[PDB]
Every structure is written in structure tokens, then in C-alpha cells.
Symmetry: D2
Subunit: 213 residues, 4 copies
């Protein structure tokens, strides 16, 4: 499945769509390609479109960054163990917001630190307003490791490697989690990619490799 | 935005698509409709298609059930506070897998309880295989409250109310979380729906109302 | 260390204390017995007293039930990897509150379900008052598997086995977590017990064995 | 209760113990002083001893740092709503390990980054060994905000303020959590302190005040 979807993505990047946007009618719950995709929530990604999936074929799991966190694992456990998927595709992407802030800055700005509140407005170009109270949850915002770049900055090699390292960490989480079988007769397989939002083209991340530093 | 998307969904249910499935070219990170959607990962939902969103217009957050958990809140905090969205749409759906199991059954089957392992195979129609070890994470699978129905069962009033109660709980979480402003000049608004996978049509959930029992 | 502490606990159960309750003066951060204990927060447990530990000798991690959850693992990772402990002792106990409710009842009563609110008052003997709103966090209360017994009920074999199964699940979590070494030169060892609050005596839980059903 | 415990702590710091270290015999589950204490797991704290609590009087919740995270809130919800406590005491402490590392360094060293692995050995004085795989959980180690000081360093004003800010964040979490009542007839009250491990004496943290930056 994954190589056919990469060919659909080549077409997509070149200006030819493959996803059919109408309602498919009645379908069974099990994704028919036995695939789960974990991608960023970024509005510039339409995961079915950029892979040429059709409605009904894959679970589509999306969160800020496409990070493999506890919820992503919850989703993948359900997807495989209950709903029979056995392939996972990770789609991080270029110009991701998770490159542009740190957990501590956003936490301090929500808590009410006046400096952090102002700095978040300067980083985002919007009128960020502190909540003025602390919260235990979310315990982590899961910004990519490293110091921030400008929000929505053009590509750079440094940026690409930060995104790739986060993909590799997610591959390692999946390939080492006690409740996801990634070897043996019940095994799931996984591959990870970066979607370039401006070209439309996926590039694959190497694995094993560095996982964020 | 939300009422125009409901009209696109009326068209979609009736067999007329609105989403354009090609790559839109270069776009800014801020979703242009200032909307975030939280939906289930179920393969039968293509969120952009069923709402007639275009690529670039909304954050698309998807997890098993479309539940508002810690990760969903992480996503919504980033979406609003960093990326300027101010409207949220919840899309649960009919025939959801989260109606068809309990946390304890899946946990016990992954841990290695032989009875639970067999019962999960009987509930799913697949060869579920225990991992044979415990895990602290995920701490909760977030199955909808109540005893299970058959996987992918036809609609029923009881089912609909179980799904609706989970939507109302998610609306209440958003409307009471310390770090999401839902009143005042920085406020976010929210509405919740159930997508019927067989008709293609959304129906709105009342709020306030019961939140699961 | 653990067998000497069991002898101190034999003395404790028989009416002879071993812990010295005065301030020990200046001490280094590394626990001098290289032990971490995870126990319930129940007021009837004084962990240093019931094991005859002295101040300075062990990390003392305590939560509702003594459950091995994400925070317990966070604590144990720090305890071993940063602070050089290499032995873990689990102390669950009899008459634990985690035998006396379910996650769903407490969640529904906090959300505002009128039935659940009344039932929690009847189970607890106090005037439980709903918060009247939902929360994403805590995602799980981690009540022991199975239907509730009366709060603070006398011992029973069924109760003991429910507590033991939760201990075994915690041993399995520790012995299978990616970030706790429990084999090789950096290994940690672990044993699990039930403290009888009325006799003062520990009893050891078998492992491997059933982990909750 | 809290002021009487501070007088017991004055005695404790001066060399006079108050906690009785023998088994108290049969007791009810509800803590008799209606108090919950959240403290660090640091071996140099014996919470009952340093407050002069007796066995049976208070819930004792302990984790790395005494941080108010999701598990601490789970514990406090159970403590109050089920078990009738209505006062909370926070006890952070001097020379805490949570001042001496960052989340990212420990995460990268567990994942296998060779630089981080070596740097953690240099910070801890022990042979830290990487696990060589990533994990989604624990999602956060909850080190105190700011750059690390040496492990187990002597007191400093900067250190004290870092610890105090973490106490204030925990007070704010408790005083703003949807499921802890801290006003009205079911209200809980809370105060926060720093325990000096070398003198034995508590000092109280001001609130409201800065919550970490
Ligand atoms: Na789509
Ligand atoms: Na003690
Ligand atoms: Zn992104
Ligand atoms: Zn679903
Ligand atoms: Zn207990
Ligand atoms: Zn500490």
C-alpha cells in the first residue's frame, strides 16, 4: 500500500489529484487498506488527498505535530488490535508549528508570566492573552526538540533534521511499545515521512537514526 | 463558518461533493477559516470532504472516538493560542468502534488474561493476540460509557444517546478547561455533531445535556 | 535490604517499632539503601515505620492505591537513573479505598450525573457534591479491577486476590517498561507485597501470576 | 491542623521528635486530621516525622519533586471526595533532584543520544546507561523550570525561588482545577512550604506569586 500511495503523492505534488471527495455510501468499520496514518493537524495537510487514499481505506490520526504520544498509541492499539490494520504511516511536515515554540514558554504564558505572554504574541503575530492560572494538563506540549525557529519559516536543512528526528523518535516509540506488535504473526509495519507543504511531495525519513538530542 | 459547512454537508449527504482534492499550492500556517475540527479517526470519515472544507482552512484533529482528552486539549490550545483559531467543531459518528468494547476488556486482553484475549477475538472477528505484559500507558482507552454493542452495529436510539453524551462531555471539557478561553475577547466557540456514516449527514448534539452516566 | 525490612516489619506487627522519628541531620540525596518503595497514600501506612526504614535510606513514592502508573514510572526512572537506586518494593494494602469504587461512577458524579452523585454519598458516608463539569484529567482513577466492595470492608480472600492482581500488574509494568532496566549490569530488582493495616504484617505477592481480569 | 504541625516541625528541627513509630492498631480509612500532604519522594523526607503527624491522620502523597501533576490531582480528588479530607499541605524541599536536570536531557539520554548519556553520568556521578529506545510515557519528567544546578547543591536564594515558584504553580493548579472544590461548603484549603533538609525546618511559600517563568 505505502508505495502506491507514494505514487499518488507524486501525482498530487505535480498537480493531479487522486482522492474522490464524495460520500462513498455504506462501508464497514475496518479500514480496507489495513493502514493507519498519523499526521499533523496542520490545515495545509489533507491526508487522504496527499496520499490518494479513498474514504474508507485508512485510519486518519492527527494531532499537533503528528507526534507519537500516549493518545497516538491509544489510537494505534485500537486500530490494529480491534480493527485489523497492520501498516502505519507517519506524516510530519515542513513549516510545522511545533518548530516554533517551547513547552516552557507556552506554559509560562498560559500561567500568567507577563514576559512569556508578550513573547508569545511577538512569536505568533497575534494577541495572545494569558489564562492567568496553572494547569496540570496537558502535561507536555511536545514541541520538537531544540530552540524555536520563526513560525511558518521557509525550509532549511536544520529544520528538516529537527522534523526527521521527531519522526524517528515516533518510529522508535511504536517499534518498542509493549502493546504494539511489530514482529511475529500479528506484526504491524511502519514507515515515516515529511510532507513538504509547498511542493506537495513526501520525502522518507531514514530509520534507525538520531531521535532529537 | 459552521452553518455554511452544514450546508456543504447536506450536499455531501445528497451525493454532491464540495472539497477540492488537489494540492492548493503555498499557504500560511494559520487555518484560514479559524476553525478546528475534532473527529474520530474512523476511515469512513474524511473530515474535509464531509464538511466541504478546503485544504488550508481548518485544523483537523482526529483520534479514536474524536474524544476530548489531554491530547485533544493540547491540540486545541496550540490551535487557538498560537495559530489564531476561534471556533471548534466536534464530529463523533455512528457505528463508532468506541461503542463496542470496554477499557478493562482490552487492557486485560493485552496483559494476557486468556478469557479476555478470546472474548476480544469474538467481539472483533479477528485473531486478537495478547501482548502478554502490562503497560502503564495508555492509561485509558476512552471507550464510550456503557456496556458494549456489537462492533459496527446499525444505528439505534440507545447508541445515538451514548455517542451524544460523549459529545456533551467533550463540550463541557472544552468549556471548563483552565487554558481554553470560551468567554471574553479571546473566546473560542464550540458546537458538537454526530456524523451518520451511512447517510453522510450530520446531526447536532444538544448542550447542555447528560454527559454519559 | 528487602529481607531485613521484612524482619523489621515482623517486629512492627508484633508491637516493636524500628524507625527513629527524629531529624537525622545532613544527608546526601542518594537513598543510602538504594531502594524505592511505591505504596498507597492511605493514612494508616507509615512506610518508613512499617518497613523499619530510617530517614535517608529509601525513596518513598505514594499515590492512591500504590498503583504503578505514569507518575510512578516517572518517579522510578528518576530514582534509579539519576539517584542510583536499584531495588523496588511495592506495598499495596488491605482495606484500600481503590477496592470501593469504579472510575465511571466517580467520573459521572464529578460531571454532575444526579444518580452517580447520590450513589457516591451512599458508598462513602459523606456528603459528596458534584463539581458539575467534565474534565479530561485525571484520565483514569485506577480503581482496582472488579466491582466495588464496601469502603473499608474487612478482609476477604476475594479482596486479597483483587489487591494482589493489581500488585502483579505493577510488577509487570516495571519489568516490561522501555526505560526501566530490569536485566543486565544496570538492572533494578522488584518485589511486591500487601500490608495488612490491622495486623501490621506484610505478605508477599507471587509473580508471575494473574494481573486483574 | 496546619499550625499545630508547624509547631511539631519547629520541635523536629530543634532535635525533638513527635511522630510515634509503632503500629497504631486498627483504624478507619478516613484520615483523622482530614489532611492530605503532597511531598517529594526524597529519602531525607519522612513526612509524618517532619510534621509530627501520627499514623492514621493524613494522606501522604509523594512523587519526584512533590509536583502537582495529573496523578497528584487523582490522589487529591479521591482523598477529598471519597475520604473526606479538606486541607492540603504541599512540602517541596531544598536540595531537590528536580533542580538538577532538564526533561530533554534525561529523555535524550534514555533514547540513546551518546552526548546526553555521557552528560547525565557527569551530572549524577553514576554510570548512567541509555535504554536505547524511545517511549511516549512518561510524557514529562517535571523538572523545575530553569537551567540545572549541581545535583544536591547547597541552598541559594536562586534555588529557593525556583522551588517556591514550583510550589506556587501547584497551589494554582489545585485552586483552579475543575474537580477540586476550593470554595463553597465542600471546599478544600491549601498551603505550601519548603522543607530545609539540613535544618529540618519548614518555611512557607507566599501565594499568589510567580509560578516559574
Ligand atoms: Na480529506
Ligand atoms: Na514516616
Ligand atoms: Zn504541524
Ligand atoms: Zn469512531
Ligand atoms: Zn489504599
Ligand atoms: Zn526532591
Amino acid at each position: 500500500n505505502t508505495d502506491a500511495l507514494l505514487e499518488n503523492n507524486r501525482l498530487y505534488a505535480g498537480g493531479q489529484a487522486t482522492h474522490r471527495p464524495g460520500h462513498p455510501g455504506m462501508q464497514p468499520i475496518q479500514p480496507s487498506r489495513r493502514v493507519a496514518v498519523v499526521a499533523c493537524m496542520d490545515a495545509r495537510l489533507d491526508v487522504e488527498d496527499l496520499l490518494g487514499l479513498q474514504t474508507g481505506e485508512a485510519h486518519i490520526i492527527r494531532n499537533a505535530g503528528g507526534v507519537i504520544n500516549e493518545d497516538a498509541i491509544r489510537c494505534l492499539i485500537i486500530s490494529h488490535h480491534l480493527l485489523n490494520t497492520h501498516e502505519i504511516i507517519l506524516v510530519h511536515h515542513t513549516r510545522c508549528g511545533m518548530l516554533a515554540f517551547t513547552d516552557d514558554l507556552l506554559r509560562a504564558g498560559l500561567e500568567g508570566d507577563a514576559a512569556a505572554e508578550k513573547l508569545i504574541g511577538q512569536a505568533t503575530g497575534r494577541a495572545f492573552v494569558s489564562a492567568g492560572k496553572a494547569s496540570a494538563s496537558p502535561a507536555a506540549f511536545q514541541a520538537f526538540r531544540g530552540p524555536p525557529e520563526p513560525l511558518d519559516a521557509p525550509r532549511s536543512d536544520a529544520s528538516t533534521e529537527r522534523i526527521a528526528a521527531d519522526v524517528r523518535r515516533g518510529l522508535s516509540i511504536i517499534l518498542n511499545h509493549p502493546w504494539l506488535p511489530t514482529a511475529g504473526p500479528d506484526a504491524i509495519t511502519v514507515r515515516g515521512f515529511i510532507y513538504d507543504v509547498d511542493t506537495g511531495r513526501l520525502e522518507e525519513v531514514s530509520y534507525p537514526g538520531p531521535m532529537g538530542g
